[model samples]
Target: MDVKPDRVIDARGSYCPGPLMELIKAYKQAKVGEVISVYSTDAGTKKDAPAWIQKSGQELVGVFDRNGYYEIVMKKVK
Candidate 1:
């Protein structure tokens, strides 16, 4: 059985591709069904990331706004 991820990625100062890239990287390193909370400052990701998640057929739990960044929560399916 895989374990859950209790860590978060703070990509708040990163840009487009940066945030999404970080998410992809983290997902790869994360365990299946583990949760990764991504904090992104990339404005495009606010609309694009979640869409990408859906496009990838991943599970997007939800998203929220905190300060000037967006917090996207997801679970690794593979």
Candidate 2:
């Protein structure tokens, strides 16, 4: 089962840098242990979010494929 997100950002209409920037912005404000999810239509975010999350030393909950978008889930560790 997936962890329920403490924050969910919908960036479905945004392009490449849009989705990634939103996630990065949210991540900066998230508390430790908080689960964050990004909903994006941009293809780059699928790779970008996870890479950033891992590089930041956070825990990645999962990445989900929605009907027309994607969800990247993560838990802030630091």
Candidate 3:
């Protein structure tokens, strides 16, 4: 099912670890089943964010390519 994000972290101008770190931090503050979407312009997050979510055992909703950035959606499963 497609789940809307409960929170969105805008890391559009941030770099590699910055975007990924912001997503992680948001995830930590989110409740179980809550979705978090990270909007990033950094190329690294295209891989890093989803990888971390999968490795952390969370649910990856989708990765969407926007105009100049990407949106990675995830849900806290724990």
Candidate 4:
């Protein structure tokens, strides 16, 4: 089933790691099962965030691009 994300963090224009890191903090603050949607301009997050989610025990649901920005969805597991 497709789940809608809960919170959205717009990190466009932020550099590598910045967007992801902000997402992490937001994830931690979010309720369990809450999905975090991040809008970023960094291309690295397309790979970096999902891979980190695997090792970090978070859920990487999806990633997409819109207009010059990337949209990343992640679920808080803990």
TM-score result, candidate 3: 0.72
Q: Candidate 4's residue-wise lDDT over 8-66, tens digit each?
A: 56566554434656456656755556667666776655555554344333457687564
Tell me, by TM-score, which candidate is best. Answer: 3
Window of ten residues with lowest summed lDDT in model 2: 13-22
lDDT for 17 (candidate 1): 22
- Model 1: residue 16 alpha-carbon error in angstroms: 3.9
Per-residue lDDT over 1-78 for candidate 1, one digit per residue giving the tens place of the 0 to 100 score: 111234465466555424655556656656557666666776545555554444333356566564688645556665
lDDT of 1: 0.54
Best of the two (2, 4) by TM-score: 2
Candidate 2 lDDT over residue span 1-78, tens digit each: 024657765567455324655556656756556667776776556667565455443457667564688656667765
TM-score of each: 0.65, 0.70, 0.72, 0.69
Better lDDT candidate (2, 4): 2
Give the Cα lDDT of each candidate: 0.54, 0.60, 0.61, 0.57
RMSD of each: 4.2, 2.8, 2.5, 2.8
| Residue 4 in candidate 2, Cα distance off native in Å | 2.5
In model 3, the clashing pairs are: none
Q: What is the Å distance of residue 56 in model 1 from its true position? A: 7.5
Measured by C-alpha RMSD in angstroms, how accurate is candidate 2?
2.8
Q: What are the clashing pairs of model 4?
A: none
Better of 1 and 2 by lDDT: 2
lDDT of 3 by residue, 1-78 (tens): 024766765567555424666556666766557677776776556566665455433467677564788656677764
